[PDB]
Amino acid sequence: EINELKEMVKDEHIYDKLVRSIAPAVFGHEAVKKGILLQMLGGVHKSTVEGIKLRGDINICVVGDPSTSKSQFLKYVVGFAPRSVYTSGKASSAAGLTAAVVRDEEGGDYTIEAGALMLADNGICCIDEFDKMDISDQVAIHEAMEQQTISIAKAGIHATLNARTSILAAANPVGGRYNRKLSLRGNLNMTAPIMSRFDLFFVILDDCNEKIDTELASHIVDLHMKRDEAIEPPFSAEQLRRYIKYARTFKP
DNA sequence: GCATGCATGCGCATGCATGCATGCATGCTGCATGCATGCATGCGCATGCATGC
């Protein structure tokens, strides 16, 4: 088992192979593939003398219209990563994201029930259709992004809970399509505090080129004809999990 | 006229209908617990209208 890990560490094209092993079913879009890997790996958490906490999670937003293949990236991550959750904008309530309190039949105590953000602690939370979120939900997401805590005050229960999680979010342009003549802020529907703390914004735009269309169509038809014998990725999922686990234990 | 035995009251001893308090235990009952139930509340979200531009 260590034989394969030490073989991986040596190869001096390992970065390109790792990039080419992510979301193999999707065609192209290498920038998003790099971003997702960097988000699965992580940064460093630091603390100053004055108790100021320096954050070390990377947050990504993918912007495209309903035509673009932006949900396949999210479905790949929710199938690969160890602790990940998939939620959608209008099928989710605030209590289902932060937490809820229920009482025991045994009597004498209460119990907390975890939400999407708590079930993704030290992990990636996937949100599809970020633009259909309410301001009430966005104030909780902002609290999870600046602080790593969730505050509960309902029915006389006070509790501070840990949400150390990264955000993967997909957003639709405000008017269906992306206006190249406006700025990024003009095309999105987010609160200023939320937009500021996102690290990378990836915009997927369509181009009309014949050779790319031929390649894409060939790929799509190949998958239907040949089932799963149409990928031949450099690495497998079980191989990739082990490398990610090993990589997260280094402190540069 | 004298001697005798019976019936009449004294002079002991014992039992007996009334009557009332006390300590123990019975028997109920008012109190504290637990719980089902259904109406109201305090709340965040989605729609339709009014006011500009």
* Cβ contact A153 with chain B strand, < 7 A: no
**What's the resolution in A?**
2.8
Sign of the Cα torsion A188, A189, A191, A194 reads negative
* Cβ contact A106 with chain B strand, < 7 A: no
Q: Report how far residue A165's alpha carbon sits from residue A124's, in angstroms, rounded to the nearest whole number.
A: 6
Q: Report how far residue A42's alpha carbon sits from residue A104's, in angstroms, rounded to the nearest whole number.
A: 38
Spanning CA of A228 to C1' of B16, the rounded length in angstroms is 122
Q: State which H helix or E strand residue A20 sits in.
A: helix A14-20
Residues with Cβ within 8 Å of residue A226, at least 6 apart in sequence: none
What topology is assigned to A1-252 in CATH?
Answer: Rossmann fold (3.40.50)
Q: What is the DSSP string of A34-80?
A: HHHHHHHH----EE-TT-PEEP----EEEE--TTS--HHHHHHHHHH
Domain ranges for chain A, please list them: 1-252
Q: Report how far residue A68's alpha carbon sits from residue A63's, in angstroms, rounded to the nearest whole number.
A: 9
Q: Report how far residue A37's alpha carbon sits from residue A85's, in angstroms, rounded to the nearest whole number.
A: 17
Write down the experimental method used for this entry.
Answer: cryo-EM
φ, ψ dihedrals at A15, nearest 5°:
-60, -45
**Residue A194 in tokens:** 């939320």
Q: Report how far residue A131's alpha carbon sits from residue A171's, in angstroms, rounded to the nearest whole number.
A: 6
Nucleotide closest to A136 measured between CA and C1': B44
**C-alpha R_g of chain A:** 21
* Cβ contact A90 with chain B strand, < 7 A: yes
Kindly report the number of other CB atoms within 10 A of residue A139's CB atom.
13
Spanning CA of A96 to C1' of B21, the rounded length in angstroms is 79
* Cβ contact A137 with chain B strand, < 7 A: yes
